[PDB]
Amino acid sequence: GVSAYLSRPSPFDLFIRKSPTITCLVVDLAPSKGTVQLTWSRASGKPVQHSTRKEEKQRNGTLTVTSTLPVGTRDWIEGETYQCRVTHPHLPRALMRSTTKTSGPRAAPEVYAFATPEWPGSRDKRTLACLIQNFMPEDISVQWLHNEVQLPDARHSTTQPRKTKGSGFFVFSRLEVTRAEWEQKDEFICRAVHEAASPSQTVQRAVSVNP
Amino acid sequence: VSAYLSRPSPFDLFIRKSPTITCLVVDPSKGTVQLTWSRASGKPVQHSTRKEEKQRNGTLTVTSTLPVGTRDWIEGETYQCRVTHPHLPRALMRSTTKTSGPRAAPEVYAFATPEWPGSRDKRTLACLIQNFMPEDISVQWLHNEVQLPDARHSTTQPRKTKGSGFFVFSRLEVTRAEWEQKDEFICRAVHEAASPSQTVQRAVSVNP
Amino acid sequence: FVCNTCPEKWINFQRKCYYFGKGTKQWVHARYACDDMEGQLVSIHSPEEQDFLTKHASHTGSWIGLRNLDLKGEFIWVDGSHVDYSNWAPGEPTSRSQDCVMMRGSGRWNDAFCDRKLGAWVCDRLATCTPPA
Amino acid sequence: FVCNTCPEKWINFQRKCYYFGKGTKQWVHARYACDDMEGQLVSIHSPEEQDFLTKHASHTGSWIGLRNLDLKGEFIWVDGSHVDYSNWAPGEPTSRSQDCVMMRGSGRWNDAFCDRKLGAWVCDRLATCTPPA
């Protein structure tokens, strides 16, 4: 019961923060004593940067171990293939996952931010929703901003990119806000960071609790 | 070889009054796969409908849909499903029962996207159905007082809110011909806790 | 015609028979147990009936034939009858979950989850009659 | 000062050195190949330079040092220089993405995917100088 998953960089880290990373997550349902050992390699044969390892015991007796490798901004965008080798002790052969930039057509996202009306027995709080659609590839970064500062990632919840009736993708983001927040400044921004978004890989729409 | 046992649709249960439960087994050689049904009480089960489908990737998908009792389901009966195969070494057993715990009627909010350049003859209608419990909900869209086909829309899986409830988001792309006919689209949510008659609904308009 | 005849294992009271079942059972499994016994879960309609049931009630708690079709909000006895007589315990019927009815050792009624397992249940059936002399 | 000195395996033209690589390589792997050779992917800036390249260009197609950082939308040579001279083939530059640049057998330029594998690539470096007599 050993599955491995290899993630691409987030568009926020790649284009804005300019410091992309890739994570290799290995979910182990029978934790036997020893070491899992996540090794990294590039398809070119060039050397890899130092990765950060983290092992976590879950609330159901399963070991979750991740290795985060920092990649090159220009190396990722230009098409380098990064690989991950997982040498598990309860497996005769090695687990190998690879990650590279999704090469194909582009479509910039369409941002739409909405605010829910006052529901009986919910005066001091409102829900702000956002529909980010018709984009390709599926890799997108959804952020919420208030007072020109980025709200913590835990405050909101974005859905996984699903396909539209056409060729693009879509995500929905939910953000519950307090009365104190909208009374301070009644303007909340939904930021989408995406490969195709022109200019500077960012699209944004502002919303108001009661315009 | 994986198996999944679904609870009845709150629409089939509370509105249609004819609930069913589906056992899905995703896999092949001699597919003499047996899907057996049983109740925890030991009482007899109604006749189930079997359907086997070959997928676009050489995988066999076999389902068995068992019709259950309206009062038997709501009162707390446990329905089980046994899956046996000649390649599989040990029987697969899945069980289903009514999620017993607190209730909260959903809050329905339907929105309409504004006109985007190069998208004149079409708009997207979105719906946020939140703060409900249990997670079992039915999301429907209506036009001309008639229910639009299920394929026309896409509802997200129920995720947990910052509090105790759940939430779903539904997307429905509409044509100019539809809103020009009647510019009123209803978003219906069917839920155990929705009072009265287990239904909550909100209408939306492309350009009020 | 005098109605006081009961089948074996059943205790009499007025025009009815009562079976004081024992064993770990859910509300619906207790319901099925009574149907197999050619009866139905107990339907309390008088303070005299409750007084009798309390005397033979299990201290752990017993299942009674009271619940709601969800598309209710209103509790209804298994025979179809509505609630005229009520012996609700203080703070009952609840709206904690916002359910099925169980009888305490004291005889008092309280809401419980449908999937909760209790060691007792009370059944009832119409008592048979002795022909006139 | 006369600039025409090149290291071994490198062909001269004006003030630059040129290496005509062979082997199946992606655009980025073609980029890495030139860095190992203490050069960089070819940057065409004159019709005289292109005329020379076309004569030594592989018929299959060659990778050239032109692409974009995405956070641009405009093509930029590996050395950092902008596009002054252009030998785009009819219908190019496209947008069947919305890319990396490759040189045809004809010498003409066309957009290609980053992951496409070509059997050739052209490298370049500044030619060294002979001091005056």
**Structure resolution in Å?**
3.1
Chains A and C touch (3+ CB pairs under 8 A): no
Pull the structure tokens for residue A137: 């590839």
Q: Distance of CA B44 to CAs B12, B20, B36, B68, Å? A: 21, 15, 12, 11
Q: Are B160 and B72 in contact (CB under 8 A)?
A: no
Q: Distance of CA A40 to CAs A1, A20, A48, Å? A: 22, 16, 7
Q: Distance of CA C62 to CAs B37, C14, C30, C69, C101, Å? A: 30, 21, 10, 21, 9
Pull the structure tokens for residue B31: 């597919």
Peptide bond into D93 cis (omega under 30): yes
DSSP assignment, residue D29?
H
Q: Which residue does chain A place closest to D29, by CA atoms?
A: A44
Ligand-binding annotation for C8, yes or no, is no
DSSP assignment, residue D105?
T
CA distance A98 to chain B (A): 22
Residues of D with Cβ-Cβ distance to A77 under 8 angstroms: 69-70
Q: For residues C31 and C28, give the distance between their C-alpha atoms in angstroms, rounded to a whole number.
A: 5
Q: Are B161 and B168 in contact (CB under 8 A)?
A: no
Pull the structure tokens for residue B103: 């209730």
Contacts of D99 (CB under 8 A, 6+ apart): D67, D68, D93, D111, D112, D113, D114
Tell me, yes or no, if B53 comes closer than 8 A to chain C by beta carbon.
Answer: no
Pick from B75, B98, B103: CB nearest C31: B75
Which helix H or strand E contains A65, and what residues bound it? strand A63-70
Rounded to 5 degrees, φ, ψ at A67 are: -130, 120
Pull the structure tokens for residue A40: 């990294």
Chains that touch C (3 or more CB pairs under 8 A): B
Chains that touch D (3 or more CB pairs under 8 A): A
Q: Which amino acid is at A172?
A: F
Q: Which amino acid is at D129?
A: C
Q: Are D27 and D47 in contact (CB under 8 A)?
A: no
Q: For residues C124 and C38, give the distance between their C-alpha atoms in angstroms, rounded to a whole number.
A: 9
Burial per residue of D84-96, b for 16 or more beta-carbon CB atoms within 10 angstroms, e otherwise: eeebebeeebeee
Half-sphere exposure of D87 (CA within 13 A, CB side): 21
Hey, how many other C-beta atoms are within 10 angstroms of the C-beta on C70? 17
Q: Distance of CA B26 to CAs B21, B59, B96, B188, Å? A: 16, 8, 18, 31
Q: Which amino acid is at D24?
A: T
Q: For residues A117 and D126, give the distance between their C-alpha atoms in angstroms, rounded to a whole number.
A: 66
Q: What is the DSSP string of D47-75?
A: HHHHHHHHHH--TT-EEEEEE--SSSSS-
Q: How far is CA B173 from the centre of its chain?
A: 20
Q: Distance of CA C71 to CAs B192, B196, C67, C125, Å? A: 8, 8, 11, 27
The dihedral sign for the CA sequence D40, D46, D49, D55: positive
Q: For residues D70 and A101, give the distance between their C-alpha atoms in angstroms, rounded to a whole number.
A: 12
Half-sphere exposure of A206 (CA within 13 A, CB side): 11
Q: Are D17 and D6 in contact (CB under 8 A)?
A: yes
Tell me the Cα Rg of chain B: 20
Q: Are B132 and B191 in contact (CB under 8 A)?
A: yes
What torsion do the CA atoms of A9, A12, A17, A23 make, to the nearest 10 degrees?
-20
Residue located via tokens 């809110």: B161
Q: For residues C78 and C42, give the distance between their C-alpha atoms in angstroms, rounded to a whole number.
A: 8
Rounded to 5 degrees, φ, ψ at C57 are: -70, 140
Tell me, yes or no, if A75 comes closer than 8 A to chain D by beta carbon.
Answer: yes
Rounded to 5 degrees, φ, ψ at B30 are: -70, 95
The domain segmentation of chain D, as residue ranges, is 10-127
Pull the structure tokens for residue B135: 């997670």
Judged by CB atoms closer than 8 Å, whether chains meet at C98 and B103 is answered as yes
Q: Are B26 and B55 in contact (CB under 8 A)?
A: no
Which helix H or strand E contains A18, and what residues bound it? none
Chains D and B touch (3+ CB pairs under 8 A): no
Residues of A with Cβ-Cβ distance to B125 under 8 angstroms: none
For domain C10-127, the CATH class is alpha beta
C93 dihedral zone (left: phi>0; alpha: psi -120 to 50; beta): beta
Q: For residues C69 and B11, give the distance between their C-alpha atoms in angstroms, rounded to a whole number.
A: 15
Residue located via tokens 């496209």: D94
Half-sphere exposure of B5 (CA within 13 A, CB side): 18
Q: For residues D81 and D83, give the distance between their C-alpha atoms in angstroms, rounded to a whole number.
A: 7
Judged by CB atoms closer than 8 Å, whether chains meet at A105 and D27 is answered as no
Peptide bond into A137 cis (omega under 30): yes
Q: How many residue pairs from chains B and C have C-beta atoms closer than 8 A?
A: 44
> Pick from A147, A153, A149, A194: which is nearest to A175 by CA?
A153
Helix %, strand %, coil % of chain B (to 5): 10, 45, 45
Pull the structure tokens for residue B112: 């309409």
Which helix H or strand E contains C8, and what residues bound it? none
Judged by CB atoms closer than 8 Å, whether chains meet at D114 and A78 is answered as yes
Q: Give the distance between the most distant pair of CA atoms in chain C.
A: 56
Rounded to 5 degrees, φ, ψ at C36 are: -65, -30
E-strand ranges in chain A read 2-6, 21-28, 38-42, 52-57, 63-70, 82-86, 95-99, 110-115, 125-135, 141-146, 149-150, 156-158, 162-163, 169-178, 188-193, 202-207
The dihedral sign for the CA sequence A145, A151, A155, A158: positive
Tell me, yes or no, if B103 comes closer than 8 A to chain C by beta carbon.
Answer: yes
Pick from B75, B102, B197: CB nearest C114: B75
Q: Are C5 and C11 in contact (CB under 8 A)?
A: no
3-class SS at C1? Answer: coil
Peptide bond into B10 cis (omega under 30): no
Q: Are B130 and B167 in contact (CB under 8 A)?
A: yes
Ligand-binding annotation for C94, yes or no, is yes
Contacts of D90 (CB under 8 A, 6+ apart): none
Three-state secondary structure readout of B19-83:
CEEEEEEECCCCCCCEEEEEECCCCCCCCCEEEEEECCCCCEEEEEEEECCHHHHHCCCCEEEEE
Q: What is the DSSP string of C24-39?
A: EE-HHHHHHHHHHTT-
CA distance D2 to chain A (A): 35
Which residue of A111, A162, A172, A205 to mutate against B (max B Cβ within 10 Å)? A172
Q: For residues B86 and B96, give the distance between their C-alpha atoms in angstroms, rounded to a whole number.
A: 25
Residues of B with Cβ-Cβ distance to A116 under 8 angstroms: 107, 109, 128
List the beta bridge partners of residue B23.
B5, B64
Length of chain C: 133
The dihedral sign for the CA sequence A149, A155, A161, A162: negative
Ligand-binding annotation for C128, yes or no, is no
Q: Distance of CA C73 to CAs B192, C79, C93, C123, Å? A: 11, 18, 11, 24
Tell me, yes or no, if B44 comes closer than 8 A to chain C by beta carbon.
Answer: no
Q: For residues D61 and D77, give the distance between their C-alpha atoms in angstroms, rounded to a whole number.
A: 18
Pull the structure tokens for residue B117: 């350049």
Hey, how many other C-beta atoms are within 10 angstroms of the C-beta on C114? 17
Judged by CB atoms closer than 8 Å, whether chains meet at B114 and A110 is answered as no
Q: Are B5 and B97 in contact (CB under 8 A)?
A: no
Rounded to 5 degrees, φ, ψ at B10 are: -55, -20
Pick from D27, D71, D96: CB nearest A79: D27
Contacts of B183 (CB under 8 A, 6+ apart): B205, B206, B207
Q: For residues A78 and A74, give the distance between their C-alpha atoms in angstroms, rounded to a whole number.
A: 6
What torsion do the CA atoms of A193, A195, A198, A204 make, to the nearest 10 degrees?
-20
Tell me the Cα Rg of chain A: 20
Which helix H or strand E contains D94, and what residues bound it? none
Q: Are A126 and A112 in contact (CB under 8 A)?
A: no
3-class SS at C76? Answer: strand
The arrangement of strands across the sheet holding A63-70 comes to A2-6, A21-28, A63-70, A52-57
Give the ranges where chain D is alpha helix by DSSP (H): 27-36, 47-56
Q: For residues A144 and A158, give the distance between their C-alpha atoms in angstroms, rounded to a whole number.
A: 11
Length of chain D: 133
Q: Are B137 and B157 in contact (CB under 8 A)?
A: no
Q: Name the experimental technique.
A: X-ray
Q: Are C111 and C122 in contact (CB under 8 A)?
A: no
Q: Are D39 and D11 in contact (CB under 8 A)?
A: no
The dihedral sign for the CA sequence B163, B165, B171, B176: negative
Pull the structure tokens for residue A106: 């582009």
Tell me, yes or no, if B153 comes closer than 8 A to chain A by beta carbon.
Answer: no
Tell me, yes or no, if B74 comes closer than 8 A to chain C by beta carbon.
Answer: yes
Q: For residues B50 and B41, give the distance between their C-alpha atoms in angstroms, rounded to a whole number.
A: 23
Chains that touch B (3 or more CB pairs under 8 A): A, C
Long-range contacts of A45-50 (CB under 8 A, 24+ apart): A46/D32, A48/A82
Pull the structure tokens for residue A195: 């490969």
Pull the structure tokens for residue A83: 């690989």
Three-state secondary structure readout of B101-167:
CCCECCEEEEEECCCCCCCCCEEEEEEEEEEEECCCCEEEEEECCEECCHHHEEECCCEECCCCCEE
Q: Which residue does chain A place closest to D31, by CA atoms?
A: A78
Q: For residues A124 and A182, give the distance between their C-alpha atoms in angstroms, rounded to a whole number.
A: 10
Q: For residues A74 and D100, give the distance between their C-alpha atoms in angstroms, rounded to a whole number.
A: 13
Q: Are D108 and D89 in contact (CB under 8 A)?
A: yes
3-class SS at A167? Answer: coil
Q: Are C87 and C50 in contact (CB under 8 A)?
A: yes
Residues of B with Cβ-Cβ distance to C26 under 8 angstroms: 76
Q: Distance of CA A142 to CAs A77, A111, A145, C55, Å? A: 20, 10, 10, 66
Task: Give all domains of chain B, ordered by start, each with its CATH number.
Answer: 1-98 (2.60.40.10), 99-206 (2.60.40.10)
The dihedral sign for the CA sequence D55, D61, D63, D67: positive
Judged by CB atoms closer than 8 Å, whether chains meet at C97 and B103 is answered as yes
